[PDB]
Amino acid sequence: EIIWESLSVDVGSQGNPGIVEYKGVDTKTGEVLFEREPIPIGTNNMGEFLAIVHGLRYLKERNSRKPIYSNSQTAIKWVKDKKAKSTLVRNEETALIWKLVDEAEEWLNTHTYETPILKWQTDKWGEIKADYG
DNA sequence: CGCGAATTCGCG
DNA sequence: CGCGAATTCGCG
């Protein structure tokens, strides 16, 4: 019960905390729909949070009914809660990723959306299509 | 229950 | 040199 007509998001990490990047792809074709170049310091959960909100914004702009898949139960919970509960220290090194997460929380607090946000079940369906690698 | 101090899980 | 959010037991 995979919905092939969907958007898959995934985060790539080199260290956690460490360099993080993300992208969103068409689950069927693998076409890259958006991508964010590496941010020097973040966490996987913060990058997944930003990836899903970027996906929500991308689909909303297009009036799309496609769902979003993410392999991160944590980040899905944070998006539904409209609050990213990261433990990453707030300092000048982490200012960029915190700014982007604070703004993504603000976007969720000021917009509505209909997009279903679904867990990708890696142990049945293999690697999420947006995977890095 | 109120809490500590463990283990587990999926992920990169 | 892990992140977060589950659990499980201990011992009240």
Distance CA(A87)–CA(A83), nearest Å, equals 12
Q: Which nucleotide, over all strands, has the C1' atom closest to the CA of A14?
A: B12
Task: Give the experimental resolution in Å.
Answer: 1.5
Tell which phi-psi region holds residue A127, choosing left (phi > 0), alpha (psi between -120 and 50) or beta.
beta
Q: Where are the domains of chain A?
A: 1-133
Nucleotides of C under 7 A from a protein CB: 2-6
The domain over range A1-133 is classified in CATH as 3.30.420.10: yes
Distance CA(A77)–CA(A72), nearest Å, equals 9
Distance CA(A131)–CA(A89), nearest Å, equals 27
Q: Name the nearest CA neighbour of A101 among A115, A121, A87.
A: A87
- A48-63 exposure pattern, b = at least 16 Cβ within 10 A, e = fewer: bbbbbbbbbebbeeee
Structure tokens at A27: 């689950």
Residue whose CA is minimally distant from C5 C1': A74
